[PDB]
Amino acid sequence: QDVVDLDFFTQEPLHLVSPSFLSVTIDANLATDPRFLILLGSPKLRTLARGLSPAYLRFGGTKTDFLIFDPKKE
Amino acid sequence: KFKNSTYSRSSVDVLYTFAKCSGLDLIFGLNALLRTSDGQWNSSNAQLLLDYCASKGYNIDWELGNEPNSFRKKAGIFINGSQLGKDFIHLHKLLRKSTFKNAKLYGPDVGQPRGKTAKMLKSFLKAGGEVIDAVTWHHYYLNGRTATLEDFLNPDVLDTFISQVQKVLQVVESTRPGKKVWLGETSSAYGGGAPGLSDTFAAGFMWLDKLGLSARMGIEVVMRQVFFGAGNYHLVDENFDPLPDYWLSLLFKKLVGTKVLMASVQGQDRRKLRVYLHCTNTDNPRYKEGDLTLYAINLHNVTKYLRLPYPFSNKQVDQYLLRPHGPDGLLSKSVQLNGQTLKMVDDQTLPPLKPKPLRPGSSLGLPAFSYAFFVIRNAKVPACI
Ligand code: NA
Ligand code: NA
Ligand code: NA
Ligand code: NA
């Protein structure tokens, strides 16, 4: 009753995913946190992120369309 | 509700350095709501950023706009998909003229179609699809303000993702057949996640199932909202501590390969026992060409015992079983792998993720409300070789 037999299909792949199939984002709103530079310097954060390589890191979100590059800003 | 803010070169630099030093490939979304008086994207600000990044030698891929389907509500302006495609063609020309070594362009980052078709996506792909390297769309199962634990455990909720994928893939196949399709921003619940739920072990059913179905249905890349940040769906909290979905993701990364196969249950499928099958990730030094990685979800309230089909029935299997740690049960923010709580060894050291070898020939025990990876060793699957 609680035993479940599985059928497998293995003769050839149905699809190929990217090596970076499991990727991640940073929401664009994080760039409004005054601590942004310090936060992304965390050694713990870097170690955790390296664990997910290879991956894309997408910087975006609603704030994508409400952010302006200012080349004179410190 | 949103107003504009500025960002600096230093912010770009730190973001790029974070990605590079972590072995990640940065995709940067450009602002699509800078418009000319004749209704076109104004590329002036992006040009400054592209020039800056090129001068620094940064290898960055690009997007333009986020969820353009909601520009009318969020910003009081309607940009149709044909116009957005024209804007993407302009951005493509700027990337071609730059010194970037073959920067890629992804878009249009539309929201999920819900109960409608993907109309803006279709018009965008007709107009601008030739210049994008992959189609991006977004998905959330539920509203974080109202989601409950029951919802996070509900196979009917999980199954709603299938129809969303089908609708998007239909539009892509009808306009740009074969173009790669990516989830460009996705998680359990919108509105910043469901408090007390999106950061728990219980969030893992939606995350693992989404990965399994995405792979099975032809999505090539899935981008988890968010690695780190304010939302409850973060993989890492703002104390920099990994939540259960981080550990789930790390195990997935280490065990699941790129070749997608298929598994299914024999007999009645109540949709609570959900199974996925890939070749094992060859980069893992424990394993070898031909090995299989089965991953499985049990949303029943009792243990289920999985029996593998011949010739895998009597192979050596390595178990990686995840269960919540502590009195919060499924609402815990800590998780155990084969009975050992997963925690960093120190700030620079991930723990070993050790398998539990099972007795060859034994059925795979999957406890109630759990998920696991099983590596079938010496599977010698030619398709994995
Ligand atoms: Na994002
Ligand atoms: Na799902
Ligand atoms: Na994206
Ligand atoms: Na954030």
Residue type, B232: N
Helix, coil or strand: residue B229: coil
Q: Quick one: tokens of B321?
A: 């079983």
Resolution in A: 1.3
CB of B206 closer than 8 Å to CB of B155: no
Give the Cα separation of B177 and B199 in Å (integer): 37
Nearest chain B Cα distance for residue A35, angstroms = 10
Place of tokens 């988890």: B224
C-alpha pair distances (Å), B181 with each of B78, B166, B256: 25, 12, 20
C-alpha pair distances (Å), B291 with each of B97, B208, B216: 45, 20, 18
- Choose from A12, A36, A56, A58 for mutation: most chain B CBs within 10 A: A58
Which ligand is the nearest neighbour of the Cα of B205?
2
Pairing relation of β-strands B304-307 and B364-366?
Answer: antiparallel
Nearest chain A Cα distance for residue B289, angstroms = 14
Helix, coil or strand: residue B217: helix
User: Containing domain of residue B81, as a range?
Assistant: 9-261
Q: Quick one: tokens of B307?
A: 């029996």
CB atoms < 10 A from the CB of B65, how many? 26
Handedness of CA B195, B199, B202, B205 (dihedral sign): positive
Q: Do B305 and A3 touch (CB under 8 A)?
A: yes
CATH assignment of the domain containing B231? 3.20.20.80
C-alpha pair distances (Å), B327 with each of B198, B323, B334: 18, 12, 10
Main-chain dihedrals φ then ψ at residue B156, nearest 5 degrees: -65, -40
**C-alpha atoms less than 13 angstroms from C-alpha of B288 in its C-beta half-sphere:** 6
CB atoms < 10 A from the CB of B191, how many? 16
Q: Among B162, B76, B161, B87, which residue's Cα sits nearest to residue B127?
A: B87
- Choose from B216, B226, B248, B278 for mutation: most chain A CBs within 10 A: B226
Place of tokens 């696991």: B372
Residues 6+ apart with CB under 8 A from B218: A15, B169, B181
Domain boundaries, chain A: 1-74
Give the Cα separation of B342 and B363 in Å (integer): 25
